[PDB]
Design a protein around this nucleic acid. Structure first.
Ligand SMILES: [Mg+2]
Ligand SMILES: [Zn+2]
Ligand SMILES: [Zn+2]
Ligand SMILES: [Zn+2]
Lengths: 141, 84, 102, 133, 43, 49, 114, 264, 196, 559, 65, 160
RNA sequence: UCGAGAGGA
């Protein structure tokens, strides 16, 4: 229909994209101080608009909640730990015969979920538990 | 052949950690092999503590042979050698 | 004998400085018994502070410099691990050859 | 083994130095004008307001381990509302015929001016601070 | 499994460092750390 | 939930990792080294599509 | 593979009697008791009841390591007053309080209706 | 009534019991709530023999699940520990045997609820081994799901124990415990971003204790002796016996001391 | 570990009574030190507690998607409407003593992942046994029940102490000690020997 | 280099390691499974035979026990299965390979063994579970963490070997380090964060707490210190109770900032005869700091006293903290409401500064500073301007942090914190950097394709105005990813060079030993130094002592 | 892969409350908060056992063997 | 550069001075230039100082650059260690580096040098030249597994 | 035995 295009690495040199599709609305204060400071764009010759920025992250980085609030090397560290977590790797774990296959007894869908999670079935096939965690200074163990 | 005379010697009379540890190890090793004990041990049953207590009363009859860089040596009896 | 006198020269500078007659009797009013105890104490402590012959001093020094190098990690001067590599294998050409004029 | 010092003060300023239950107080002996005192007072146990006239004393008694109180059997030389035990740590020769004495009451500090007590206030671990109505 | 099926491998002036041109084509921070950090990347 | 995309050689599921290469049939200009007789180069890697 | 059985937390081993009593070497009228197979559930009650006896000078317990469940209790008291008598006082007074508690509660429960 | 600790029951049910426990030294309350959770004994599955299992799940998975089902243990005192008795492996005087059999005949999935467990040993007239059922429909706990053509057959031997050995022998769930609602003892230092009163909400327990007077200074000889507790039960034992047997196990715990002291 | 690089093994496991209990009786499934929070700057974990708490109580789902204008102030407004302290803190009582903890504890639900490194599949200790034929040294790897490495890195440390006898032990008796005849005149291993 | 200077050795082990505060310093938490597997050959003697025969009877599948017996003939007696497994009578002169038992010396390890004190002797304390438990204050000399770390443990086989572990390889001996002439280990983390909380004047301890706290100290005199306050309540100060851990005869003097002898802030340190006169205790006082408490005790009292002292401090402080409690929320990183307005408008003032400098450069009116090109000068001005922005914003936040806030407390004692972390989590994370410069143009003349070309603004060159708490925008996140990736490249890159550097140093000077005349030399004999260290004294044998003759006016020196 | 009998944190048997949860949603058209509240899971420790539960067992049954 | 210096009284006080920092090194022709202090001047390169002022001067320069590397990270290591390494480089006579060819060719045995780079070449030339090994070095004895004269092995032990 | 890849500090 013509409402979407496939931009390769070289072609986006010649085009001006945009973060939100409400960057194309008119201008003319009262605001919430906790929200992130967003650079007023000052640009108006747009060609494309981003589908949604969250898509820059891969699958393993899609899992992280609030990576925008988090140290970058921490997200790198997580990305290599999340492929290490135990869980239900396949629904047919019983039928298959493979050399190693640890499986979580009681997987739970995480209470804090990326919206991108929905398309990798993390809530459908998770690999962690909603532990009640208390950061605390207890016995020093 | 040549030796370093007892009268003129210029090495630290105080025994270093390394000779104390070696000497204690030698003593404990031979003590383990049913060797005679030269102190009235106060119920001590460990060759390490046995050797330490022999040393403390200077009942250990061994001599060091500190070798100098020229090939020459200096003998230092355990009596001579001090411990702080 | 000269090398001995040399080897304690700064220690003797400190030593004479602290044991000034006025200071020995005014800043801290030492008595004879206490002064003799102090004099013997220092001899024992110093003679305990001698290098025990047999120490593997080179290996110790190498590790002593090398361990903090592992900790090294982050006015445009060349410093850090690259500077250390320059220093170590006598780089003929240096990334920052500089000079400070007095 | 008797009282080493007694005087009467009026507090000048109460300093809650970022402390929830502790205050820092400065007060000069009203009778002897040239003698002042600086000391840390727990305010939760003994409330100390500004411009309060308080009696102040120091004793040497009235090692051996502590014995918890039993009725008035172990009668204690005080009819006070606040007391402390500390240990002298410095004595300052400020100037001729004037002296200053420092105490650290297990953390809480003290400072005492004036030469009037030619006697007592020895360089001694034993020290009691006693405050009255 | 997914993140294995979305991987690359650059066999070998500054390849490891992340680039302005990687925005949206390669995940910014997901990569092994150590032997091959940034040489091996995920989509 | 299996998404596919793997082969089964000798019974072991196998994945071909996408190899990364510099593109072919493009022109690049490279400033050469300081102690080098030639100042610049422009290289083309020619391979038949 | 390594964990000791859970039953060691409340079951005495071979020739491990319940309490071992040792006189404190340094202090006077002082004793250390190595309760076996018990912990803060029980020991804290004993110590806190020792504090109430006004002729009891010292009462304190400590757990060497939470792996094991053997905690020491040490006592000191007035002259001519073996701490075991203060300990007996404490335990028996505790028991009286607990029985009174249970009976009062039963009365309230039977008063209650639901 | 009787001199000592005074208890006022506020609200009551077989599942929940909330009361005020007056005039008790705090250490007693911690220790009682501690032993209320653990040392109090109760019967639950400790052994399982799985004959035929065609389920999706693994047997040890099902055996774990079986352990945590709550079985009636009101008369557990009449029963004895296996470890104590003299039988070869187990007997009717210490162990109660249960049998579980299910087969998938329906096109739809056949469940395996708690009620389908059956009791095989000689009861000998004790209130022992009944799988507790609080589910409104009556089915109770759900152990496994079975397709058409799947069967599961096993035998479970329940034994006496306590929560200190394993958490299935735990008669209580979560016990509320809070004292000095207004922090009048200064027994917790509030973390306040602006105003401690506005940021932290008052608990219901503040309703009963008198509000503080700021003009009055900190009372220092006051100590904690009034507590607000709420005990919950899994149904294995009614709440009243949970707390009563907690007290009784605590006083037995103490009594062994007296005997052992005598032996010295 | 969690989803934010907060790795770490278990130090000790406590029964529920030993655990510090909140007023409602809830007991932490897990306890971690607060000292890993500042140095690593993992505020995402630290916010996940709040979002997961409000989603657990409210009965919805936590929206932790990146580049969303969701704010801690609003999340905490909802949490306050659920009767808890807005920034996640909770009054906590010590389990051993029942005396209230002076510092109210940041406590709530935080998704955690079980990692693939379990000790007993890494535990290994060896006294004697298998040796390579070529080197007459223990075969490499615990899978083959082999011995560990006394590296040149370790040899340096032993050198630095001057511990010559321990060092001889490690490099001969405790690994591949051997006795060989030699002829002095050639000064080599030419010699032929029959010892019986 | 791999089969001759670094052989694979027997009598070795390896585990996930954990830290245990009720373990003392030279103890190690070897598990039974390892202890049953490892052995020591011990020759039978009259002193040992009576225990050793019982051990041989006990067997190898439970502990204590023994797996092997060696005889006059020289042929093994495998005790795992043998008909005479239970009727042994050991003649004198027979070796018995018994399991390692408590208070045995074993050489610990953690690769990479950079320095000599990353491999030191330990006393066995056989414990149940499958982890090498070890003391907390041992993490600094191994650079360990309980996050999946693995540590080896070699076992001696002769009496001289055992001695050398005890006599020169022991942990107390390495408490003072030749390198950086000062202590190695120090109080860390929960103990260090707790000492600060305990020592505060405002912290006052009750009687019931004091008796247990007193008992917990292992070597305790049995003398209950008289309370600080004797009046409305007998109360104890945290300093007073802590003092019991410190032995008699230890004096310490330290002065911080405005430390009058009547200290106002309770800062600095004056400690008399093992009593704490005044000062809050923290890392400067009890860390690995030069001139610290550990530094005093190790040479004044001895190694053994201070090795015991580590455990004693730990046991008191862990208990008090355990019942005081501590935890870090994210209310601990929310700066004051008005302060946030001030912070963001501060950033705005710096933003305007960058704009106006930019326009001035756009008019080609930039005073070209000496040396730098015009574009370089623009760079430096802007980079430093934005760095001012982030540092001033952080210190506007740090100033604005109340005392209850945990993160300050962690920073305050030096347990685990620094200023900049507060800045990046509560003010503004800062400016990213690649190869020194800001985020350069990857796309031709623009950083990202959401920016117009030739844009040198702060937002488009890598500045991250938003804070970790507030949340980074998509472009900020990508720029941050660039910076973090470069940092990780460096991290991976630095180490290998550092390992090679350490290897080259060690192999260059490995022959260097002081001879029996203080002539530092090598195998050739050619002198390197005529007296080691240009004073003939070793490195732990050192202290920062001021010489009062160097400084001062000539009259003041005269007087 | 199946409803856990009890909540790990506290211990209230949530296992008998699963099938009722789904009935609450599908026929009474209730939001999940009120769905768990009807069941009486007052404390969130047990509450997140059912909200965050993924009943994988259905996929496992469908394989005929 | 702010710099403290003796005041006429004798007390030390700051005496700030203007000092120029360059970008290239040609020490040989810069110190001679007038208007400057030609005894104080200092370069960042020890090799040029070695060429001009002498090896003893080059030693202090070498040390000071190692020191600056260390102290720039807010660190400190005792003088003896660094000075011993610096002395090892200087004592050979030139500026012998810590590298495969800078120092490993020497008189220091064969196995000693063959335990670190050019293993087979070190041994090849050693056999070609009939190199003598004292086996006093640690590495030679480590290869041979005997007790190396290290610390405990430095002294022989005999009876009375 | 040999090379290969994937991992943990
Ligand atoms: Mg690690
Ligand atoms: Zn039976
Ligand atoms: Zn021959
Ligand atoms: Zn629950």
């Amino acid at each position: 229909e013509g409402l979407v295009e496939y931009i390769d690495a070289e072609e986006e040199e010649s085009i001006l994209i945009a973060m939100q599709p409400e960057d194309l609305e008119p201008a003319e204060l009262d605001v919430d101080p906790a929200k992130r400071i967003r650079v007023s764009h000052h640009a108006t010759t747009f060609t494309h608009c981003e589908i949604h920025p969250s898509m820059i992250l891969g699958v393993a980085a899609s899992i992280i909640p609030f990576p925008d609030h988090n140290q970058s090397p921490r997200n790198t560290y997580q990305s290599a730990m999340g492929k290490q977590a135990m869980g239900v790797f396949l629904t047919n774990y019983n039928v298959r015969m493979d050399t190693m296959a640890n499986i979580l007894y009681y997987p739970q869908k995480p209470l804090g979920t990326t919206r991108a999670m929905e398309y990798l079935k993390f809530r459908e096939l998770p690999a962690g538990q909603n532990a009640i965690v208390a950061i605390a200074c207890y016995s020093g163990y | 052949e040549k030796a370093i005379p007892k009268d003129q010697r210029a090495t630290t009379p105080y025994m270093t950690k390394y000779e104390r540890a070696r000497i204690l190890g030698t003593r404990a090793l031979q003590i383990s092999m049913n060797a005679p004990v030269f102190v009235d041990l106060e119920g001590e049953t460990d060759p390490l503590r046995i050797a330490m207590k022999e040393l403390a009363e200077k009942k250990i009859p061994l001599v060091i042979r500190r070798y100098l860089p020229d090939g020459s040596f200096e003998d230092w009896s355990v009596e001579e050698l001090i411990v702080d | 004998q000269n090398a001995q006198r040399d080897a304690v020269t700064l220690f003797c500078c400190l030593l004479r400085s602290r044991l000034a007659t006025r200071r020995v009797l005014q800043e801290y009013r030492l008595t004879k018994q206490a002064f003799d105890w102090v004099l013997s104490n220092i001899e024992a402590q110093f003679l305990r502070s001698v290098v025990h012959p047999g120490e593997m001093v080179g290996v110790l020094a190498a590790q002593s410099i090398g361990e903090p190098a592992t900790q090294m990690t982050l006015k445009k001067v060349t410093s850090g691990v690259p500077r250390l590599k320059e220093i170590l294998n006598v780089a003929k050409n240096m990334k920052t050859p500089s000079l400070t004029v007095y | 083994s008797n009282t080493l010092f007694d005087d009467i003060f009026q507090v000048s300023e109460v300093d809650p130095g970022r402390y929830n239950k502790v205050c820092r107080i400065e007060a000069a002996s009203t009778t002897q004008d040239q003698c002042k005192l600086t000391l840390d007072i727990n305010v939760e146990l003994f409330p100390v307001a500004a411009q309060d006239s308080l009696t102040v004393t120091i004793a040497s008694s009235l090692t051996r381990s502590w014995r918890p109180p039993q009725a008035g059997d172990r009668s204690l030389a005080d009819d006070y509302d606040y007391v402390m035990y500390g240990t002298a740590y410095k004595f300052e020769e400020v100037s001729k015929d004037l002296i200053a004495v420092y105490y650290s009451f297990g953390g809480l500090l003290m400072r005492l001016e004036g030469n009037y007590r030619n006697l007592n206030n020895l360089k001694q671990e034993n020290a009691y601070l006693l405050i009255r109505r | 499994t997914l993140s294995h099926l979305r991987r690359t491998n650059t066999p070998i002036a500054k390849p490891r460092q992340l680039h302005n041109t990687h925005w949206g084509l390669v995940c910014p921070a997901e990569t092994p750390e150590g032997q091959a950090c940034g040489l091996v990347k995920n989509l | 939930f299996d998404m596919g995309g793997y082969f089964i050689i000798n019974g072991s599921e196998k994945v071909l990792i996408a190899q990364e290469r510099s593109a072919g049939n493009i022109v690049q200009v490279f400033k050469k080294a300081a102690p080098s007789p030639i100042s610049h180069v422009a290289e083309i890697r020619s391979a038949l599509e | 593979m390594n964990a000791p059985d859970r039953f060691e937390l409340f079951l005495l081993g071979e020739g491990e009697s319940k309490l071992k009593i040792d006189p404190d070497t340094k202090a006077p009228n002082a004793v250390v008791i190595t309760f076996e197979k018990e912990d803060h559930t029980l020991g804290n009650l004993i110590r806190a009841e020792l504090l109430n006896d006004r002729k009891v000078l010292f009462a304190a317990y400590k757990v060497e390591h939470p792996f094991f469940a053997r905690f020491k209790l040490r006592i000191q008291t007035t002259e001519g007053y073996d701490p075991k008598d203060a300990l007996k006082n404490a335990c028996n007074s505790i028991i009286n309080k607990l029985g009174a508690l249970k009976t009062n509660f039963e009365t309230e429960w039977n008063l209650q209706t639901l | 009534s009787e001199e000592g600790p005074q208890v006022k029951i506020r609200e009551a049910s077989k599942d929940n019991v909330d009361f005020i426990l007056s005039n008790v030294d705090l250490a007693m309350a911690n220790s009682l709530r501690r032993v209320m959770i653990a040392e109090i004994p109760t019967l639950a599955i400790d052994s399982v023999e799985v004959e035929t299992n065609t389920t999706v799940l693994a047997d040890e998975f099902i055996a774990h699940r079986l352990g945590l089902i709550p079985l009636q243990s009101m008369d557990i005192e009449q029963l004895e520990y296996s470890r104590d008795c003299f039988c070869e492996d187990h007997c009717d005087k210490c162990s109660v045997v249960l049998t579980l059999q299910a087969f998938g005949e329906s096109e739809s999935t056949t469940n395996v609820y708690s009620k389908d467990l059956v009791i095989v040993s000689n009861l000998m007239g004790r209130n022992i081994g009944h799988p507790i059922i609080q589910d409104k429909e009556g089915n109770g706990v759900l152990i496994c799901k079975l397709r058409k053509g799947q069967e599961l057959k096993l035998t479970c031997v329940a034994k006496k124990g306590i929560a200190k050995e394993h958490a299935k022998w735990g008669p209580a769930a979560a016990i509320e415990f809070e004292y000095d609602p207004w922090n009048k003892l200064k027994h917790t230092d509030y973390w306040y971003e602006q105003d401690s009163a506005k940021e932290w909400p008052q608990s219901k327990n503040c309703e009963y204790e008198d509000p503080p007077n700021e003009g009055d200074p900190f009372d220092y000889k006051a100590q904690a002796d009034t507590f607000y507790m709420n005990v919950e039960s899994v149904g294995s034992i009614p709440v009243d016996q949970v707390v009563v047997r907690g007290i009784d196990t605590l006083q037995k715990k103490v009594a062994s001391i007296l005997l052992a002291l005598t032996q010295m | 570990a969690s989803r934010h690089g907060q790795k770490g093994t278990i130090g000790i496991t406590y029964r529920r009574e030993d655990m510090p209990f909140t007023a409602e009786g809830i007991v932490p499934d897990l306890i971690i030190n607060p000292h890993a929070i500042p140095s690593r700057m993992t505020v995402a974990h630290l916010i996940e507690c709040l979002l997961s708490k409000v989603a657990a109580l409210s009965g919805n789902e936590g929206d932790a998607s990146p580049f969303t204008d969701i704010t801690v102030e609003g999340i905490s407004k909802l949490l306050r409407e659920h009767g808890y302290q807005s920034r996640g803190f909770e009054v906590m009582y010590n389990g051993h003593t029942g005396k209230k903890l002076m510092a109210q504890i940041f406590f709530g639900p935080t998704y955690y992942q079980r990692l693939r490194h379990m000790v007993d599949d890494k535990i290994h200790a060896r006294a004697r046994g298998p040796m390579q034929v070529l080197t007459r040294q223990p075969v490499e790897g615990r899978s083959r029940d082999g011995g560990l490495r006394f590296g040149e890195m370790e040899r340096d440390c032993m050198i630095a102490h001057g511990a010559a006898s321990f060092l001889k032990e490690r490099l001969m008796e405790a690994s591949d000690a051997f006795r060989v005849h030699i002829c002095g005149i050639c000064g080599l291993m030419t010699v032929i020997a029959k010892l019986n | 280099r791999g089969n001759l200077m670094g052989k694979r050795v027997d009598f070795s082990a390896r585990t996930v390691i954990s830290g245990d505060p009720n373990l003392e310093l030279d103890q190690v938490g070897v598990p039974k499974s390892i202890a049953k597997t490892l052995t020591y050959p011990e020759v039978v003697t009259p002193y040992n035979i009576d225990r050793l025969t019982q051990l041989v009877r006990n067997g190898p599948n439970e502990h204590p026990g023994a797996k092997y017996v060696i005889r006059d003939s020289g042929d093994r007696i495998d005790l795992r299965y043998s008909k005479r497994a239970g009727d042994i009578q050991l003649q004198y002169g027979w070796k018995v390979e018994r399991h390692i038992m408590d208070n045995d010396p074993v050489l610990f390890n953690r690769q990479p063994s950079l320095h000599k004190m990353s491999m030191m002797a330990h006393r066995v304390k056989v414990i149940p579970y499958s982890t090498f438990r070890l003391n907390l204050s041992v993490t600094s000399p191994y650079n360990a963490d309980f996050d999946g770390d693995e540590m080896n443990l070699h076992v001696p086989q002769s009496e001289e070997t055992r001695a050398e572990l005890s006599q020169l390889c022991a942990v107390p001996l390495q408490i003072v380090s030749p390198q950086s002439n000062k202590p190695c280990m120090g109080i860390v983390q929960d103990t260090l964060c707790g000492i600060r909380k305990l020592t505060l004047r405002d912290t006052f301890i009750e009687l019931d707490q004091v008796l247990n706290m007193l008992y917990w100290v292992p070597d305790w005199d049995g003398v209950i210190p008289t309370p600080a306050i004797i009046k409305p309540k007998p109360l104890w100060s945290g300093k007073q109770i802590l003092s019991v851990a410190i032995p008699n005869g230890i004096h310490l003097q330290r002065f911080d900032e405005g430390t009058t002898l009547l200290s106002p802030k309770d800062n600095g340190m004056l400690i008399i005869d093992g009593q704490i006169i005044f000062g809050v205790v923290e890392k400067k006082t009890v860390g690995s700091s030069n001139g610290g408490l550990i530094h005093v005790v190790t040479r004044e009292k001895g190694p053994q006293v201070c090795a015991k002292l580590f455990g004693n401090i730990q046991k008191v402080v862990n208990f008090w903290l355990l019942h005081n409690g501590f935890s870090t929320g994210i209310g601990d990183t929310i700066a004051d409401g008005p302060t946030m307005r001030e912070i963001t408008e501060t950033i705005a003032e710096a933003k305007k500064k960058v704009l106006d400098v930019t326009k001035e450069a756009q008019a080609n009116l930039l005073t070209a500073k000496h040396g730098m090109t015009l574009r370089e000068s623009f760079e430096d001005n802007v980079v430093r301007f934005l760095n001012e922005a982030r540092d001033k914003a952080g210190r506007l936040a740090e100033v604005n942090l109340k005392d209850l806030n945990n993160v300050k407390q962690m920073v305050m004692a030096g347990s685990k914190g620094s200023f900049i972390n507060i800045a990046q989590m509560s003010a503004c994370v800062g400016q990213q950097s690649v190869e020194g410069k800001r985020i350069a143009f990857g796309f031709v003349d623009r950083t990202l394709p959401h920016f117009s070309k030739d844009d040198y603004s702060p937002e488009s060159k890598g500045f991250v105005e938003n804070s970790y708490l507030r949340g980074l925008t998509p472009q900020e996140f990508f720029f941050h990813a660039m910076g973090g990736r470069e940092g990780l490249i460096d991290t991976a890159v630095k180490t290998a060079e550092t390992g090679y550097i350490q290897r080259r140093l060690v192999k260059a000077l490995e022959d260097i030993m002081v001879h029996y005349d203080n002539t530092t030399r090598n195998s050739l004999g050619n002198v390197i130094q005529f007296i080691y260290g240009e004073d003939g004294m070793d490195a732990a044998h050192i202290e920062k002592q001021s010489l009062d003759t160097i400084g001062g006016s000539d009259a003041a020196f005269e007087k | 892969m199946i409803v856990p009998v009890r909540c790990f944190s506290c211990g209230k048997v949530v296992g008998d409350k699963w099938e009722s949860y789904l009935n609450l949603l599908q026929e009474d058209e209730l939001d999940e908060g009120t769905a768990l509240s009807r069941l009486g899971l007052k404390r969130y420790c047990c509450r997140r056992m059912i909200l965050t539960h993924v009943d994988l067992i259905e996929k496992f049954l469908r394989y005929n063997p | 550069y702010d710099r403290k210096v003796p005041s006429p009284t004798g007390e030390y006080v700051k005496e700030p001075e203007w000092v120029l920092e360059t970008d290239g090194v040609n020490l040989s022709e810069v110190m001679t230039v007038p208007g400057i202090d030609p005894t104080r001047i200092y370069t960042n390169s020890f090799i040029d100082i070695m060429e001009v002022l002498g090896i003893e001067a080059g030693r202090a320069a070498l040390y000071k650059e190692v020191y600056n590397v260390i102290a720039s990270d807010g660190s400190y290591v005792n003088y003896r260690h660094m000075a011993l390494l610096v002395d090892v480089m200087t004592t050979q006579g030139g500026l012998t580096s810590v590298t495969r060819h800078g120092f490993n060719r020497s008189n220091t045995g064969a196995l000693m040098r063959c335990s670190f780079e050019e293993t087979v070449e070190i041994l090849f030339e050693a056999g070609a030249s009939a190199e003598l090994d004292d086996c006093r070095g640690v590495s030679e004895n480590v290869i041979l597994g005997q007790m190396a004269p290290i610390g405990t092995g430095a002294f022989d032990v005999m009876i009375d």
